[PDB]
A paper describes a structure:
On the basis of our dPER crystal structure, we have constructed and crystallized a shorter dPER fragment, dPERΔαF, containing the two PAS domains but lacking the αF helix. The crystal structure of dPERΔαF was determined by molecular replacement using the refined dPER structure as search model. Overall, the structure of the dPERΔαF monomer is very similar to dPER with average root mean square deviations (rmsds) of 1.1 Å for 230 Cα positions. In the dPERΔαF structure, the intramolecular PAS-A–PAS-B interactions are unchanged compared to the dimeric structure with helices αA′ and αA*′ of PAS-B packing against strands βC, βD, and βE and helix αC of PAS-A. Although traceable with confidence, helices αA, αA, and αB and the βA-βB loop forming the Trp482 binding pocket of PAS-A are represented by somewhat weaker electron density and higher B-factors, suggesting them to be more flexible in the monomeric structure. Furthermore, the βA-βB loop of PAS-A has changed its conformation compared to dPER, likely as a result of the missing dimer interaction with Trp482 of PAS-B. The circular dichroism (CD) spectra of dPERΔαF however closely resemble those of the dPER fragment reflecting no changes of secondary structure composition apart from the missing αF helix. Consequently, dPER dimerization does not require major structural rearrangements in the two PAS domains, but stabilises the PAS-A fold by inserting Trp482 into its hydrophobic pocket and possibly also by covering the PAS-A β-sheet surface with the αF helix.
PERIOD proteins are central components of the Drosophila and mammalian circadian clocks. Examples include the Drosophila (d) and mouse (m) PERIOD proteins as well as the bHLH-PAS transcription factors d/mCLOCK, dCYCLE, and mBMAL1, which contain two tandemly organized PAS domains (referred to as PAS-A and PAS-B) for protein-protein interactions. Whereas the PAS domains of dPER are involved in dTIM binding, the PAS domains of mPER1, 2, and 3 mediate homo- and heterodimerization of the three PERIOD homologues in the mammalian circadian clock.
Author numbering: 238 to 294, 309 to 320, 334 to 346, 364 to 538
Amino acid sequence: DSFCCVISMHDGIVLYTTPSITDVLGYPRDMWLGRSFIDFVHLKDRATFASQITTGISTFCVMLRRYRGSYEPFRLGLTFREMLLVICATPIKSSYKVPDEILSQKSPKFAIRHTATGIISHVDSAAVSALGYLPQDLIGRSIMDFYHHEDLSVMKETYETVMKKGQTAGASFCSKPYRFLIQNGCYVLLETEWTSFVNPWSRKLEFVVGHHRVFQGPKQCNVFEAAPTCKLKISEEAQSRNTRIKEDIVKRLAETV
């Protein structure tokens, strides 16, 4: 179930509002006829929207907000018509259906990728329905930021092996299930296969590519949802003892490949 909006260059606002909106999203047709779409999309996604309309004359997700006077996920798919734009905001759901699920083989194939510094550049869309992270939430942060601490000490050896193997013309050696936190805070186990691109001559690690196929869903299903917190621990003798192995896998980007 979707619904549409429409506009463009002279101001914004919204002209139409598919009568299927007082349903799918909460409020009435002419209810939106009021002002600019743009100020309906979460302060967050806002930035990418006005950059995807400029880069068009498709598809990309953003977070829209219901109306009661609880933002929800959406997958805007636009179309440039003669001007004005037709936006069919289809809502997006959470791929997991049970709890501590054990996804089959069909399970989507979503692959995030990152720079030596440890920052994810591109990030498949197939990952927004199984990680509750709309690209923009990520695409720009530190990949090491996610991994589970009681893990990066054994995670390291995995990353390393992407050099040793990344020393070949494009070797791919499949990792072993490793925890990784979603949007709701839970931890899934991806069945990650790796591969990197080392600049042939400067012989440096340009970027990593992880063909992430999920292997086990969250304790509490419904990715997106709300984000709690119960995980602390010796935030002194280890919350810094780890930053050691992290900021060590960062400096483990240097040539020697």
